[PDB]
Ligand binder design. Structure first.
Ligand SMILES: CC(=O)N[C@@H]1[C@@H](O[C@@H]2O[C@H](CO)[C@H](O)[C@H](O)[C@H]2O[C@@H]2O[C@@H](C)[C@@H](O)[C@@H](O)[C@@H]2O)[C@H](O[C@@H]2O[C@@H](C)[C@@H](O)[C@@H](O)[C@@H]2O)[C@@H](CO)O[C@H]1O
Lengths: 306, 306
């Protein structure tokens, strides 16, 4: 089976780290950061890595039952799996699939149905993934909400993410921090089963990022969100399971109207893209442009400069 | 080019009428109501129909600029397209792409960024698709919110849907009404350019629906939501654009563990599925089962009983 990537254009695709569309392609130097996202991680032959799962809408959602923290507007959620089965904390994953992979405050809504009579309720809620109560690997997290009485125990409860918030007397755009992983077990333990950090290894190369702007809900948040693979590419590799014939697939980005190649890039078998460029750059592309697999090369292939 | 459907299982796929996962397959008699959804509509050779677009996360989202209605907590939104380009009310589509295709109250969050300084804000908000102000074909809708002063004019504003609500001392589960289309032009005009209504046309057949349960945010809503095609099938057909060799594709639903066919169904070229069954039925399926295209058949093919 021949390897392929989707022909969907960048704006026709979805960010793999938050449920929002892609907006653009971005390249920048990453030496100052550790680039180790856990969502949007998939090998080219369809092996999911880290906390990656297949659904574009389950990214950064949580499901489970909640318990009120008396005297506050906070609730603890005991997590269930994404299909309401028991959560298994012994699975060899860093955290439940789809768990956020950055430190920040995510605002959205908590919703609940009472199974007995079908009564429902929904409240604005925020989860702070850097807080000591954020322990998804252990099966528990905390939300700050807009009620101190409405949610019931023993009832299915869902968190739908919307955007990010920034608080404090800190500098503008100081949070979220998209390249800092939460501690999935809080302070009890270190992160386990992580998808590896990625970095360019060939001279003159940088990572190529698929970038979106997260909605902001309060303050002055850093809304940039970069993923290594579109979610639709994850679904595609997962289904095709095309075997890699070398360590690097050469892709060309093509304009369909003219047939002309705009740039070329390396898709590494372990699931990330590099380009030959130095410095921060928002790539200028035709709206109908798309990526096309052209051939198998090695890690020492010299790309045409972007 | 041979026709194929995705091998993703039902639980690995997304509802095409609301941004939530599929949960199950359902069949029932549909003679009493009109089955004319506008999202999740696509031919097998990849022509999108109705208000259908490619992104799972832009379903029931709105974008545009907002203006406050004095003396209230309501805002009018002047709609933009999903990539912030101007919306053209003269295109031969029923309403902007991704516009909700059922009458009900959809609750979510309105979020806004001030372009000049990166300040952000977000509020709970509801849009009632059956109300007199819901005129998305004409380019405007109204939101009910919990503020009367916070949103700014002339700034990009996004609505992220979360769930549905039901109000009043009315009968439980009376709304939403998933098979009643909004009037996209309100009372000024009638709906146009709709994807056709669908019905079984062969004796003993019923529609097969891909079913989800919408989150409920208030009251006693009817949370069932049936789509004709999973969103991933829409993206797949759009990309492949395989020619239809007859009006009916025979699909088999297969258990990969045993290799045995569980049931068969007809995928019609114009984009919906039928099965041979009479009565309301929640299909019981193995979690790893999937659809497989087997052959093009003629108009006289009789399906094996489901
Ligand atoms: C606390 C509670 O259950 N309240 C009931 C109330 O329902 C609340 O109505 C107010 C409007 O004043 C808000 O819409 C609340 O969101 C709503 O509470 C929601 O819905 C109820 C049924 C529960 O599921 C709750 O968990 C959830 O937060 C209700 O008012 C009636 O029903 C509501 C939904 C609305 O349609 C009203 O117009 C209507 O009078 C009353 C009477 O049924 O009962 C209260 O106990």
């Amino acid at each position: 089976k021949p390897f392929t990537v989707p022909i969907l254009t960048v704006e026709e695709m979805t960010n793999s780290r938050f449920p929002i569309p892609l907006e653009k392609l971005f390249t920048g130097p990453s030496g100052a950061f550790v680039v180790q996202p856990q969502n949007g991680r998939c090998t080219t032959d369809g092996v999911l890595l880290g906390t990656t799962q297949l659904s574009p809408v389950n990214i950064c959602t949580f499901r489970g039952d909640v318990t009120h923290i008396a005297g506050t507007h906070n609730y603890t959620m005991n997590l269930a799996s994404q299909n309401w089965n028991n959560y298994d904390p012994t699975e060899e994953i860093p955290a439940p699939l789809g768990t956020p992979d950055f430190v920040g405050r995510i605002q959205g809504m908590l919703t609940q149905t009472t199974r007995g009579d079908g009564s429902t309720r929904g409240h604005k809620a925020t989860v702070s993934t850097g807080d000591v109560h954020f322990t998804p690997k252990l099966g528990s997290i905390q939300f700050n909400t807009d009620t101190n009485n409405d949610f019931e125990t023993g009832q299915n409860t869902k968190f739908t993410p919307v955007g990010v918030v920034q608080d404090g007397n800190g500098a503008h755009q100081n949070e979220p921090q998209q390249w800092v992983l939460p501690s999935y077990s809080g302070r009890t333990g270190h992160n386990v089963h992580l998808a590896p950090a990625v970095a360019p290894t060939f001279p003159g190369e940088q990572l190529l990022f698929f970038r979106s702007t997260m909605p902001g809900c309060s303050g002055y948040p850093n809304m940039n969100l970069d993923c290594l693979l579109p979610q639709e590419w994850v679904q595609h590799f997962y289904q095709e399971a095309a075997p890699a014939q070398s360590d690097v697939a050469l892709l060309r980005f093509v304009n369909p109207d003219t047939g002309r190649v705009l740039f070329e890039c390396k898709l590494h078998k372990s699931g990330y893209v590099t380009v030959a460029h130095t410095g921060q750059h928002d790539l200028v592309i035709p709206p109908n442009g798309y990526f096309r697999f052209d051939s198998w090369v090695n890690q020492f292939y010299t790309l045409a400069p972007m």
